[PDB]
Amino acid sequence: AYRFNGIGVTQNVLYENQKLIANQFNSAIGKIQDSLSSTPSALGKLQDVVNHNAQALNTLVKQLSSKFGAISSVLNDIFSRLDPPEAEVQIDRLITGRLQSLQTYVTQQLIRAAEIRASANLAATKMSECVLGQSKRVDFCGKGYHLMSFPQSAPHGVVFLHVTYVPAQEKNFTTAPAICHDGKAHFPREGVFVSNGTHWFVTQRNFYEPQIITTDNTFVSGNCDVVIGIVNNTVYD
Amino acid sequence: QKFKGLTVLPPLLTDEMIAQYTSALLAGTITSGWTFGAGPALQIPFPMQMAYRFNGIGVTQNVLYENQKLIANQFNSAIGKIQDSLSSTPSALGKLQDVVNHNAQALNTLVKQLSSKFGAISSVLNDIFSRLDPPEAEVQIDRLITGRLQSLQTYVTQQLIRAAEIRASANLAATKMSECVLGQSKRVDFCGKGYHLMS
Amino acid sequence: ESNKKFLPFQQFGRDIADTTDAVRDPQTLEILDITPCSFGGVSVITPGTNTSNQVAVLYQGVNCTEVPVAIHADQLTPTWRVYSTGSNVFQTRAGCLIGAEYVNNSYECDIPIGAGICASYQTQSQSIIAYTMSLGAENSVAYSNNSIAIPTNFTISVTTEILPVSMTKTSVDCTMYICGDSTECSNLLLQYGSFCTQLKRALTGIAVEQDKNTQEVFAQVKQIYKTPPIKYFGGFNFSQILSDPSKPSKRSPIEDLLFNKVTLADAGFIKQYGDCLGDIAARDLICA
Amino acid sequence: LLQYGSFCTQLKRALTGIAVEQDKNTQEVFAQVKQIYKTPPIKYFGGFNF
Amino acid sequence: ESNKKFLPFQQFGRDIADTTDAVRDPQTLEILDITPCSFGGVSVITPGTNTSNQVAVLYQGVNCTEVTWRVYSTGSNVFQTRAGCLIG
Ligand SMILES: *[C@@H]1O[C@H](CO)[C@@H](O[C@@H]2O[C@H](CO)[C@@H](O)[C@H](O)[C@H]2NC(C)=O)[C@H](O)[C@H]1NC(C)=O
Ligand SMILES: *[C@@H]1O[C@H](CO)[C@@H](O[C@@H]2O[C@H](CO)[C@@H](O)[C@H](O)[C@H]2NC(C)=O)[C@H](O)[C@H]1NC(C)=O
Ligand SMILES: *[C@@H]1O[C@H](CO)[C@@H](O)[C@H](O)[C@H]1NC(C)=O
Ligand SMILES: *[C@@H]1O[C@H](CO)[C@@H](O)[C@H](O)[C@H]1NC(C)=O
Ligand SMILES: *[C@@H]1O[C@H](CO)[C@@H](O)[C@H](O)[C@H]1NC(C)=O
Ligand SMILES: *[C@@H]1O[C@H](CO)[C@@H](O)[C@H](O)[C@H]1NC(C)=O
Ligand SMILES: *[C@@H]1O[C@H](CO)[C@@H](O)[C@H](O)[C@H]1NC(C)=O
Ligand SMILES: *[C@@H]1O[C@H](CO)[C@@H](O)[C@H](O)[C@H]1NC(C)=O
Ligand SMILES: *[C@@H]1O[C@H](CO)[C@@H](O)[C@H](O)[C@H]1NC(C)=O
Ligand SMILES: *[C@@H]1O[C@H](CO)[C@@H](O)[C@H](O)[C@H]1NC(C)=O
Ligand SMILES: *[C@@H]1O[C@H](CO)[C@@H](O)[C@H](O)[C@H]1NC(C)=O
Fold this sequence. Notes:
four-stranded antiparallel sheet; binds a molecule of 2 linked components (NAG-NAG); 46% helix; elongated; binds 2-acetamido-2-deoxy-beta-D-glucopyranose; 5 chains; 237 residues; Spike protein S1 (chain E); part of a larger assembly; alpha+beta
């Protein structure tokens, strides 16, 4: 009820649709659990994280078979078949090539580590705001009006289960920005003036709930001759 | 450049497609407020949406409902003056100009590096092979090959670093698109200098 | 033939890269050009070999009527000459595409090709089709200055987000990697400075940073709260996310599903050397 | 040059990665919504001038 | 001892890194394997020298049932970890 009050929905909505909301949440949880198994390529991010390290180590191992311009890739053969004056000339090439390979590996690892650190900082921020509270940022903590989130552990990462609120089943109405009564304008405190074609009602924003117009939910603030589109009707006491 | 093995590939999304995306975003904003970013788009008149946004920043609806004409004129004047300012000041698009210039100069340096000697006797492989025999021709060939490989490695490393920076900027731009355009932000100095209304 | 006018008795001509571009014939005083023979990139568009063995070829930066003289045709194998002019040729800004049939429809993009052009494997007789990618379904909401829309029903939805946190911590040994069993190589390598110290410092920094990342993500709270013995939360149950004692490591069913889905190819951490030497026939990558 | 191994292929792999990343950046920035709305034929919005 | 099936015309084996793995004895034509003898890293665990001079040694990735200074012997202070074997 607090979390619906957060996004602009009164408590009575949940207090009257508790069972429906619970059933919907249960069905969604079951559906996502089945969908994770059904979809083969879901965890591509983590799979790529593993594959990058595997491929880099394999390339580093494979690089040992190069000659880099010398006569052989085995140091013992050079030592056995050449005198030191030429052995040094042949060996420095191999040493330099292997040093270059190691340097390239280290630089690539540094760049990838920076990227992973950025991702980890984003994950920590999402854990702080999505899970330990209710977020107001748009498209942060899921698509829609945020309700809550849950963390789950994964190899080399984390998975978030965002729970959001989505409207549905819209309907057209006729609206007016103010209401004239006894020569006084009337604006709604919280709501929008809507008409069903005969009678005018004040309803909340994101859930159709018509209410009678009364002094309690309106304030006067001026005169009817300034506003554009104002409509005159009677307000009860 | 293409005669030396360096090519430029075209982007997947064309300018027409990007313009269509931008026009769709603008139309959705104008005709529905922020509802199209949270669910199905719901119609609402523009003065009422602006009243919603004054209510958001902390000003009652009557202020706009009584100063509608003045606010509209002020908005029109500002949006008109933006074009004049952009046309006048010839230093506004500095970031994008630098983005173009960096790539241009990097490619130019990579191309021009092909004329270096790297301690060899010449920068022409054909001349080296024509004037020397293998036992010491291979030394010069190795020198040239190592130098050119070093040049390629330097180019690739700089490109990787610049790509990381551009990715950070693009992530920030995506966040601004999500929060400043599809809603109204409460962060200070994130959208604009003052109480944010639109984008 | 060259139309560049030349100051007389001037022979050579260079380009931006300072290479020979125009030459003067010694016998007849005529100026020629040394533009390289035609060339360009070749890209192969294929679905998985698990499905079919049909491919399409893209020629970057080449107009479709110049391909046979650009790829040096009429000498390659007849299999390669099929992917020459032949039939079903389309022209894009990226270059000439041969082997795919253009289609007037528009779907989502499957295999990116060039500027707004994609490709896919369609049933139409399976074939390869190239089209223009679709931006999405057309829509138009009706704007009015006295009309509003208000929802009358809601929906609870649950999505999924995946983020990497840490990578694998490794370590390298210069002497073992470069010299191996030799000792004279080590004696020679002792004269190359502190490259090994630098690499060790970098790898150690990365290794510590990974653990720091994990701690920052997960060690938010410091009190280990316990789940109440009974599970009733007004009709919601959370059995799919709470711990299951029977399952290994007291993990949730969803966590077990994730751990089974991700194929961690590095078992490791089993201090394996005796079994590493024992089973040579395995050719284990970790042992290698 | 054939005697240098994958040191001539690592650069190609990295460049391809960057090239794919650029398109990913553009897609994430601009493809926020997948419904192509159309602007009303009449362009009167309370006195605002678009 | 080896069980590789060398063909009669083959006399050497190679790994991914093109290093000799198997060999055939010239006098007695049998097949043998070559593996380097064990090695591994060493780490020292100490408080600050301002506090004490006692240290501990960790042998990374080594099962210490088969474990230039040999002063740090067992001493009934041998413990087994996943990252190695702690001594001291
Ligand atoms: C709001 O949506 C829910 C979800 O569809 C509706 O509940 C369903 O109503 C139908 C019709 O009575 C039943 O057959 C279903 O069993 C209900 N549950 C589900 C999960 O579908 C609810 O009726 C809607 N509210 C209104 C006012 O239309
Ligand atoms: C929690 O909700 C789920 C949703 O179905 C239930 O999980 C299964 O429910 C079926 C229905 O009878 C049982 O047959 C299964 O044994 C349940 N578990 C599994 C793994 O399928 C679960 O029963 C619900 N919890 C409670 C206390 O009712
Ligand atoms: C509102 O009116 C328009 C008129 O064109 C209609 O297209 C739209 O669907 C209506 N909304 C409904 C019926 O929910
Ligand atoms: C509109 O609401 C009024 C309530 O005063 C009711 O009398 C009338 O029947 C309603 N009309 C429609 C079309 O719902
Ligand atoms: C509102 O009242 C005025 C006079 O009090 C009258 O002229 C006007 O017609 C009324 N509004 C409507 C919509 O009839
Ligand atoms: C080159 O010499 C030949 C004689 O072999 C002669 O026929 C030809 O005309 C000469 N060309 C000149 C002088 O340009
Ligand atoms: C056809 O090829 C020629 C060869 O250079 C090129 O100049 C021309 O622009 C090409 N035509 C089209 C329409 O691209
Ligand atoms: C409202 O919309 C209609 C139709 O687009 C237009 O004719 C009219 O001028 C607008 N304004 C008012 C106050 O009716
Ligand atoms: C504002 O809209 C009017 C249409 O009434 C148009 O004539 C005018 O050019 C627009 N403003 C600007 C600055 O173009
Ligand atoms: C090789 O010579 C030794 C003695 O020198 C002998 O014992 C052995 O049988 C010989 N092996 C072969 C294969 O001839
Ligand atoms: C260490 O070696 C002993 C004896 O070979 C063995 O019983 C024990 O399981 C080993 N520890 C491991 C493999 O962790």
